[PDB]
Write an enzyme that holds these catalytic residues in place. Structure first.
Site, PDB file in Angstrom:
ATOM      1  N   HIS A  79      -4.115   7.829   4.307  1.00  0.00           N
ATOM      2  CA  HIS A  79      -4.267   6.464   3.744  1.00  0.00           C
ATOM      3  C   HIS A  79      -5.741   6.082   3.841  1.00  0.00           C
ATOM      4  O   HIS A  79      -6.333   5.797   2.793  1.00  0.00           O
ATOM      5  CB  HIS A  79      -3.387   5.444   4.480  1.00  0.00           C
ATOM      6  CG  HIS A  79      -3.169   4.230   3.656  1.00  0.00           C
ATOM      7  ND1 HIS A  79      -3.026   4.317   2.275  1.00  0.00           N
ATOM      8  CD2 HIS A  79      -3.079   2.924   3.991  1.00  0.00           C
ATOM      9  CE1 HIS A  79      -2.856   3.110   1.788  1.00  0.00           C
ATOM     10  NE2 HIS A  79      -2.889   2.232   2.821  1.00  0.00           N
TER      11      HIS A  79
ATOM     12  N   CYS B 178       0.845  -1.234   0.000  1.00  0.00           N
ATOM     13  CA  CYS B 178       0.000   0.000   0.000  1.00  0.00           C
ATOM     14  C   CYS B 178       0.876   1.279   0.000  1.00  0.00           C
ATOM     15  O   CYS B 178       0.459   2.298  -0.610  1.00  0.00           O
ATOM     16  CB  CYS B 178      -0.995  -0.004   1.160  1.00  0.00           C
ATOM     17  SG  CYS B 178      -1.613  -1.644   1.651  1.00  0.00           S
TER      18      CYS B 178
ATOM     19  N   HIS C 245      -9.311   1.242  -2.381  1.00  0.00           N
ATOM     20  CA  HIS C 245      -7.880   1.063  -2.077  1.00  0.00           C
ATOM     21  C   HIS C 245      -7.202   0.246  -3.180  1.00  0.00           C
ATOM     22  O   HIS C 245      -7.258  -0.971  -3.184  1.00  0.00           O
ATOM     23  CB  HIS C 245      -7.791   0.404  -0.703  1.00  0.00           C
ATOM     24  CG  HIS C 245      -6.402   0.136  -0.284  1.00  0.00           C
ATOM     25  ND1 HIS C 245      -5.421   1.054  -0.469  1.00  0.00           N
ATOM     26  CD2 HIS C 245      -5.826  -0.954   0.242  1.00  0.00           C
ATOM     27  CE1 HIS C 245      -4.281   0.559  -0.060  1.00  0.00           C
ATOM     28  NE2 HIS C 245      -4.500  -0.679   0.377  1.00  0.00           N
TER      29      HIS C 245
END
Lengths: 97, 212, 163, 96, 774
Positions: free
Chosen positions: E574, E337, E615
């Site tokens: 995030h 990520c 995401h």
């Protein structure tokens, strides 16, 4: 405002089982899966529009509407009376507008 | 159509003759690569010597349609198709052509449905105030090169057959011969409507032997 | 109908076409393998390895000469026997793309019966079928029959046979 | 008609007024600077009320900072926001 | 009065045509940009050590960075946005020719070929566009028929009674015999020459069974998206993993946003060895991995080179092989990520180390069946069946910082940024969307949970506060400017003393060789004066706080440009929409702000872009960086429109504000971007508003830059509209800018540069410009 909360629930005032479940939800404790509230006011403004339906046209839709706007308002009140009595609540009445 | 013609050997006809020998005789497959190669020469000669100049020219600098602003384009249309001496559009179809372009400009640079500023093309019979009015409502059009769709739309309007041919070459492609040679006979009788009023640009038909 | 062993020209064209995953017509016969696979150096020597163990002996520097004379140089020795690559590709075509129960024997029998094509022509139509692999799974007998029909038509049109 | 709609799992709860107070103030502050809300607008008093009804020590410091770092010399609208700010900070302090 | 009396009354309506803009940054007059930055900045900074984002792009669930931003900031498409979406999704295609007799020039429906007016695009397609974009039920036709409601598996059974013999080739029969041993009997058929295969009792077979998987929703690139629409050829489309197509479009679209229509233009300014690719993925070509691990096992037909297509470094390879043709650094990170922030960290350092002057940075990840299933097994992703039980629709399943958040939404796409030295950006006249002030990575600590988010990135705010009674003179920009001026006078003396010493040494050389000697030694003194000034500027302007343990890297990065900790307006979180991640990231940003003495009542404004996009893993921070730059150059801060109710736990973090609606501000000065990867990959980046750069140059250099950019912008809008209508945004390079003979000559001359060839008209290395004295 501060200390206010809003709780939006899906609900059919036409449904007897929805009326029982909604009141039984508001009055269940947080552990059991409810709000653990005790109603101070009930404002039952749920209604469905009937236009053009005169006496000879009274049918399914009218008989349903009448359950939303009368019968199940007596079931909501009844349910709120049952729950308060169950929990021995005699000094905190729920005002029905 | 490849028929011989006796013309007075003006600079324009010399240019024509040169292109006949070097460009218009080449086979259809080698035409476009040759035009690309010779583009800068071909544009200089059109602009100097011929009765149909390179349209995309700003202050004598050889641009392209793709590298010209909407204001540059509108001013070039008024400069080639509107006669300052007689204070009129040479052809009414040319005035329409210019209006169609101004309406396209308003279409490209308006954010919402509005009224045209050019409601009747009769307003263009004073062209400078009409330009200033359009490019004041839409000043972004002064600073932006032509949208690729508007280039295509322009070239489409230059091939409209219910219209007097345009007095300029807008593009070097497979149809360069038609842009160059179409509608070449009126200029000798209307020098007011030629770039510098230059006869030496034009085609004048005349017999070699009757010229004594 | 008269028997005719498959031409090295057709086999070469089908193997190249199939290997590039391109239609049998898209590839022109008069072009080097190197021009078809210009970039990919891997597929170059992969096609050469496939043509090696198909037609046994290969000409020296085969990948910078057009498929025209390569067909001729192979045909000189090649005797219309499908070999290993084309046999394995046809087995894969049948087993991976057929209704089920419809095998290569039953396909060949159906070609021999309805279209009356002998073993030479059967090899050829099947190679055309390989070039037009349905890339799925033929559902019913009827679909596979129709597919083999449309392939027999294309094969016939390529070689110049009437049906 | 009598089909059940109610389920406990579908109940949605709104209770994050502490966050919305700061958002509401910031949205007002920028709407006044951008000259979307003027000094005559009644929605300036409605948003004042809403911010006073949510007043706490986090919101009061949020307002103090954003107002005491507004440069009033930048425009009319900055003087207007700085004046209305300073007032709203007094109001929110009285109704804590 | 007839109909002719009312014809002069009747008046023409102008309908708008979509005029899509590249939204380059607006450039203020020098007088206004001189006021925002302190007067001491001019001359202070070494602009070869200032990194800028020159261009950016993405491919994602909402199309491009343009369309995504309209959906993020405004909640709805403009005419431009709607037209752009319809073109991307393939609903409209341009037409310029004859259409049913009349000549037509415009958009036409891509199926019917019926003309479509721009005004009609919203009435005709907006519903389809919204239905088939964003976070939505997984579409099988985009994932090779994958349907999570019917997920294929195979169960091993043992035969109890012999099977009907089936026909097989000799080879495949021997293969059935080799595997099964004595549990199978293969017999040749004499008639035809193929074999019969009989599986006996105790043989092993695999019978397909279908599992019903509970993750039905993902962030998928809009239905209709095709690389052919941008100009990628079918022979590239067949060769490469579908992830590579996202990277190839993102990289050309990023170059367009930078005003660089032909990448070879870069080689007019920098050597071929000075263009880096610092971009990366978490998992790389997972469609190729499936190919080699599942499809090969099932004997399905897979390309022989499928291995190379799987490697994470292969997408950057294709970008070099098809567009850039550089020989610069190639440093492919793998940070899960945090990949895209690690990519910026690496690319910044690649440029500050002098190895490259331009990097392509970013990240990319695909969504495929196997990763979706494995994310479900780790319970990382939201369970879609639980979300339906809670009456949530797919659009509102990603809801970061909310009370009820319960797992992230998997998405797919890529995000690219072009970074380069400010010095080169100004010299090329490319737009400048933001300064990369700081970019860092951190691990966490000793633990046993690879997916656990940690607080290692907290170190970017590390500062000694033992003795803080008197403010250090190092933070005061006037003091630093005064020290640079002192040094600049000493460098001036040093150049006078080298030039007199060169004159003394020139006399001993004979007069015929004296000219060449003086040229060679004057150039060297020029080089060494440049070097010493740049080292002074570096030591006082750029790196005044590297040896100072009383200045946090985060504080020093902002202080460089005159900014303070209070000027960090926006924090792009995030914010995956998971219980642990959203608390931990709040808590981390809060501690940074509290330690650096951020003013009480000045929270950073949280931006949670993953409520819209989902995401995408690798690409996550590359999207956040593309949104950070859009925030900076607009002053618009988008609201988390899925922030129904902010988690009560987050209230304790006073330095964070979680908005639910877009705030049109009067300017954002700086944006922090935080990511938290699997495997303790924490990352931060600080992007400063580009107007803080122009304070560091003079008015003549600014005005030169502004004229170059204006010209380059106009050229790029011409390129873009042409490429859009004729599906040729992407144009693969057939040949390198050098021939194969010149290859070694160009690689070994650092001052080789491409020149406009007259014949071809293309940018090539000519032999005359290689080891040339000029």
């Amino acid at each position: 405002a501060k200390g206010s909360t809003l709780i939006v629930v899906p609900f059919n005032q036409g449904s007897k089982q929805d009326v029982e479940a909604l009141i039984e939800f508001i009055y269940d404790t947080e552990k059991n899966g409810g709000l653990g509230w005790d109603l101070d006011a009930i404002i039952p403004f749920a209604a469905i529009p009937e236009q053009g339906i005169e006496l000879e046209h009274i049918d399914s839709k009218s008989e349903f509407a009448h359950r939303i706007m009368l019968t199940n308002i007596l079931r909501m009140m009844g349910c709120v009376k049952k729950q308060k009595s169950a929990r021995g609540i005699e000094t905190r009445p729920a005002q029905v507008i | 159509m490849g028929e011989p013609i006796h013309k007075i050997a003006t600079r324009g006809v010399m240019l024509w003759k040169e292109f006949d020998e070097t460009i218009f005789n080449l086979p259809k497959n080698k035409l476009v690569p040759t035009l690309e190669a010779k583009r800068d020469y071909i544009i200089s000669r059109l602009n100097a010597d011929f009765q149909k100049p390179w349209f995309a020219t700003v202050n004598g600098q050889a641009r392209d349609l793709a590298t010209m602003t909407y204001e540059e384009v509108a001013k070039r249309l008024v400069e080639l198709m509107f006669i300052r001496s007689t204070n009129s559009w040479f052809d009414v179809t040319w005035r329409t052509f210019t209006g169609d372009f101004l309406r396209r400009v308003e279409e490209r640079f308006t954010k919402s449905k509005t009224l045209s500023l050019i409601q009747s093309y009769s307003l263009l019979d004073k062209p400078d105030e009409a330009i200033e009015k359009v490019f004041n409502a839409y000043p972004a059009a002064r600073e932006q090169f032509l949208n690729a769709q508007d280039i295509d739309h322009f070239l489409s309007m230059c091939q409209n057959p219910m219209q007097k041919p345009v007095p300029f070459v807008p593009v070097l492609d497979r149809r360069f011969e038609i842009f160059f040679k179409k509608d070449s006979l009126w200029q000798s009788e209307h020098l007011e409507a030629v770039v510098d009023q230059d006869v030496q640009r034009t085609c004048i038909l005349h017999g070699p032997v009757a010229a004594q | 109908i008269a028997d005719e062993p498959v031409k090295a020209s057709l086999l070469l064209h089908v193997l190249v076409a199939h290997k590039l995953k391109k239609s049998l017509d898209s590839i022109p016969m008069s072009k080097t393998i190197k021009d078809l696979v210009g970039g990919k150096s891997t597929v170059q020597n992969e096609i050469l390895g496939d043509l090696g163990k198909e037609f046994g002996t290969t000409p020296e520097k085969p990948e910078e000469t057009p498929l025209e004379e390569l067909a001729e140089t192979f045909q000189d020795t090649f005797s219309g026997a499908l070999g290993k690559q084309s046999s394995s590709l046809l087995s894969r075509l049948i087993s991976s793309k057929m209704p089920g129960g419809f095998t290569i024997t039953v396909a060949r029998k159906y070609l021999q019966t309805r279209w009356g094509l002998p073993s030479g022509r059967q090899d050829g139509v099947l190679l055309v079928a390989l070039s037009n692999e349905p890339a799925a799974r033929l559902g019913s007998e009827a679909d596979a029959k129709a597919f083999l029909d449309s392939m027999a038509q294309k094969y016939a049109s390529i070689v110049g046979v009437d049906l | 008609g009598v089909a059940t709609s109610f389920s406990r799992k579908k109940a949605r709860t709104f209770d994050s007024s502490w966050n919305w107070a700061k958002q509401s103030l910031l949205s007002l502050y920028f709407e006044i600077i951008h000259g979307v809300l003027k000094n005559v607008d009644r929605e300036v008093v409605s948003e004042a009320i809403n911010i006073m009804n949510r007043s706490n020590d986090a919101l009061i410091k949020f307002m103090e900072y954003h107002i005491s770092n507004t440069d009033e010399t930048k425009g009319e609208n900055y003087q207007l926001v700085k004046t209305l700010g300073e007032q709203l900070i007094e109001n929110c302090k009285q109704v804590l | 009065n007839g109909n002719s009396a009312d014809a002069a009354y009747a008046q023409v309506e102008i309908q708008p045509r979509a005029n899509i803009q590249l939204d380059f940054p607006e450039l203020k007059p020098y007088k206004q940009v001189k006021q925002i930055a302190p007067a001491e900045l001019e001359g202070l900074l070494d602009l070869e050590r200032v990194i800028v984002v020159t261009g950016f792009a993405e491919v994602g669930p909402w199309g491009s960075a343009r369309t995504r931003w309209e959906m993020e900031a405004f909640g709805e498409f403009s005419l431009e946005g709607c037209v752009e979406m319809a073109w991307i999704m393939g609903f409209i295609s341009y037409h310029n020719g004859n259409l049913k007799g009349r000549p037509y020039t415009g958009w036409v429906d891509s199926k019917t070929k019926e003309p479509v007016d721009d005004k009609d695009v919203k009435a005709k397609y907006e519903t389809s566009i919204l239905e088939h974009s964003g976070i939505r039920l997984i579409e099988p036709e985009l994932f090779n028929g994958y349907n999570p409601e019917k997920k294929e598996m195979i169960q091993e059974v043992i035969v109890e009674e012999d099977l009907e013999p089936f026909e097989a080739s000799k080879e495949t029969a021997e293969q059935f015999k080799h595997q099964h041993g004595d549990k199978v009997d293969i017999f040749e058929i004499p008639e035809t020459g193929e074999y019969s295969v009989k599986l006996l009792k105790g043989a092993t077979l695999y019978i397909p069974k279908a599992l019903r998987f509970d993750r039905l929703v993902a962030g998928q690139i809009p239905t209709g998206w095709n690389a052919k629409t941008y100009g990628i050829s079918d022979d590239i489309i067949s060769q490469v993993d579908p992830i590579t197509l996202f990277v190839l479009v993102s990289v050309v679209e990023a170059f367009i946003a930078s005003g660089i229509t032909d990448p070879y233009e870069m080689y007019k300014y920098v050597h071929v060895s000075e263009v880096g690719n610092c971009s990366g993925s978490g998992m790389g070509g997972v469609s190729a991995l499936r190919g080699m691990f599942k499809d090969r096992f099932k004997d399905e037909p897979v390309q022989n080179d499928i291995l190379q297509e799987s490697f994470i470094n292969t997408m950057s390879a294709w970008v070099n092989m098809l567009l850039i043709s550089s020989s610069g650094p190639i440093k492919t990170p793998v940070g899960a990520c945090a990949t895209s922030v690690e990519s910026v960290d690496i690319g910044v350092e690649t440029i500050l180390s002098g190895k490259a002057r331009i990097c392509i940075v970013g990240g990319y990840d695909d969504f495929q069946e196997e990763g979706s299933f494995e994310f479900g097994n780790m319970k990382a992703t939201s369970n879609t069946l639980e979300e339906f039980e809670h009456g949530r629709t797919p659009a509102e399943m990603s809801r970061p910082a909310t009370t009820t958040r319960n797992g992230f939404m998997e998405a797919q796409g890529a995000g690219i940024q072009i970074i380069m030295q400010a010095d080169l950006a100004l010299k090329m006249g490319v737009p400048i969307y933001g300064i990369v002030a700081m970019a860092a990575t951190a691990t966490d600590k000793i633990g046993r949970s690879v997916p656990a988010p940690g607080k290692g990135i907290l170190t970017t705010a590390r500062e000694h506060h033992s003795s803080v009674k008197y403010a250090s003179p190092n933070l005061n920009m006037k003091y630093r400017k005064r020290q640079l001026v002192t040094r600049e006078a000493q460098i001036k003396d040093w150049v006078e003393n080298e030039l007199e010493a060169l004159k003394l040494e020139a006399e001993e050389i004979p007069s015929e060789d004296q000219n060449e000697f003086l040229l060679e030694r004057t150039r060297e003194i020029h080089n060494e004066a440049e070097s010493q000034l740049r080292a002074a500027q570096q030591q006082w302007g750029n790196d005044f706080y590297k040896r100072d343990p009383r200045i946090a890297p985060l504080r020093g990065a902002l202080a460089t440009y005159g900014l303070t900790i209070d000027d960090l307006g926006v924090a792009s979180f995030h914010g995956t929409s998971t219980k642990a991640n959203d608390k931990n990231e709040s808590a981390t940003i809060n501690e940074m702000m509290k330690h650096l003495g951020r003013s009480e009542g000045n929270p950073v404004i949280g931006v949670f872009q993953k409520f819209l996009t989902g995401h995408p893993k690798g690409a996550a921070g590359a999207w956040m960086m593309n949104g950070a730059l859009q925030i900076l150059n607009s002053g618009i801060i988008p609201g988390n429109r899925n922030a129904d109710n902010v988690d009560k736990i987050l209230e304790q973090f006073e330095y964070v504000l979680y908005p639910s609606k877009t705030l049109k501000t009067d300017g954002v000065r700086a944006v922090s971007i935080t990511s938290f990867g699997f495997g303790q990959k924490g990352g931060q980046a600080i992007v400063v508003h580009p107007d803080y750069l122009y304070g560091a140059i003079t008015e003549d250099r600014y005005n030169e830059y502004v004229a170059k950019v204006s010209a380059r912008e106009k050229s790029a809008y011409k390129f873009f509209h042409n490429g859009m209508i004729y599906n040729k945004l992407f144009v693969s390079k057939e040949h390198a800018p050098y021939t194969d003979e010149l290859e070694e000559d160009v690689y070994l001359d650092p001052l080789a540069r491409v020149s406009k060839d007259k014949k071809s008209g293309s940018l090539t290395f000519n032999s005359k410009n290689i080891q040339s004295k000029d």
